[PDB]
Amino acid sequence: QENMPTLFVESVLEVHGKFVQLINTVLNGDQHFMSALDKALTSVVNYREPKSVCKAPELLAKYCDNLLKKSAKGMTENEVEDRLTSFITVFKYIDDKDVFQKFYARMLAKRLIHGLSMSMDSEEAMINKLKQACGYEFTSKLHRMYTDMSVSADLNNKFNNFIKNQDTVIDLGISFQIYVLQAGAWPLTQAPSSTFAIPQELEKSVQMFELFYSQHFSGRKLTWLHYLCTGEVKMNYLGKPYVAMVTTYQMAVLLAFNNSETVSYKELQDSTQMNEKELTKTIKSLLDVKMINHDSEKEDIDAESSFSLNMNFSSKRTKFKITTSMQ
C-alpha cells in the first residue's frame, strides 16, 4: 500500500510492453490479440488495495502527481513526458476515471495552490494527453482547475486594473495575490468554520477583491479559506530585523501585538474571532518558534492565558516560514 503508485504503473507497463512486442513479432500485430491484451490489462488495472475502495484510480493519480512534482529534477522534461505517455497507456484501462479525476484533482489542487508542479506546461500537456486518452469528461474537472489557475493571472491583472480604473488610486498598502477556484471542479470543500476577523491590514484588500470578483463567476460559492492563506510579517522590535512567513491566523495574532506588547487569549480571540482550537494551535505554533512568550507557569495555552512578545527572539535565518497545518 505505501509505494503502490510507482510499482503498479511500472508492473502494468512491463506486462503491456512484453505482450505488444510478442504480438507484433509472433502474431503479426493482429488486432484480436491486441484487443485481448487490452481486455486483460483492463481487468488487471481495476485492482483495489486490501480493505480499500478501488485504489487504481488513486494510485495512477499519486504516480502521475509524483512525476508532475518538481521532485522529478534529475529527469528531463522529455523523460517525464515519455513516462507520462506510458502512463496514458495504463490510464485508458481505468474503469472509474471520475475517481481518478477527483484524486488527481486533490493532488493537482495541492500542487497548483502551493506551486509544487514541475512546470505548468507539463501539467497542461498531461491534462491534454489524458483528454486524448479518456475524452473531455475525464479531464473536465482537471481542465477547469488548470483553467482557474491560468485565468488567475488575468484575474489579478484585472484586479490591479480595477483598482487603477477607480477615480482614486486605491493603494492597498500590501501586495495582494489571489487564486479563485471553482467548487464543483476542485476538491477544496473546507468552508471556514471560524468567522475569522480579518486583520485591518488585509480588510481593504479583501473587500475590494469581493466587490471585484463577484462581477464575473457563479456555481458553487468559494469563500475566504483564511487557513490556506499566508503572508509575511516583519519583526522590527528586535535587535536584528526578522521576516516570518506566517499564516493569516498567525499574522492576525502577531498583528494584535501592534496594539500591545502583551495580549490576553481573550483579546486575541475577540480581535481575531478565531475558534478556540485553531487560536490555541496558532498561538502554540508561535510559542514553539519562541516568537511569543506565555506569562503563565505553563508554556501551553488556556482561555485565561496572557502572551508577551518575545523581546529576545533570535533565529538562525533572517527570513523563515512558520508552517502551521492550516495550509
Binding site: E137, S140, S175, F217, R220, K221, T223, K234, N236, M251
Partner: protein, 89 residues
Amino acid sequence: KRFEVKKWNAVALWAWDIVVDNCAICRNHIMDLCIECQANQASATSEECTVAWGVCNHAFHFHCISRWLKTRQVCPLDNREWEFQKYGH
C-alpha cells in the same frame, strides 16, 4: 517595539451565485450535468456540461446551449438572444 505593514498577503475569495431553476433545452436542474451528459458520464463529452449563463440572466448546461445554438440563438427560459456572460459548477 515595532511590527508594521510592508508586504502582507492573505486571501478572501468570492461573494455568491447559484442558479436555482431548470435548463429549458432538456428540462433538468441547471447545476447538474445535462441529461444526455449525466446519463453517459463515461462518454468523452459528459462531465463538461456544468452551468453557462447568458445575457438573458438565465442559465443552462454548457453542451445543451452549445447544441441549441444550431437553432435560433434565444434562451428557451425567456426567449431573449443568447450570449455567454458567466460560468459555474
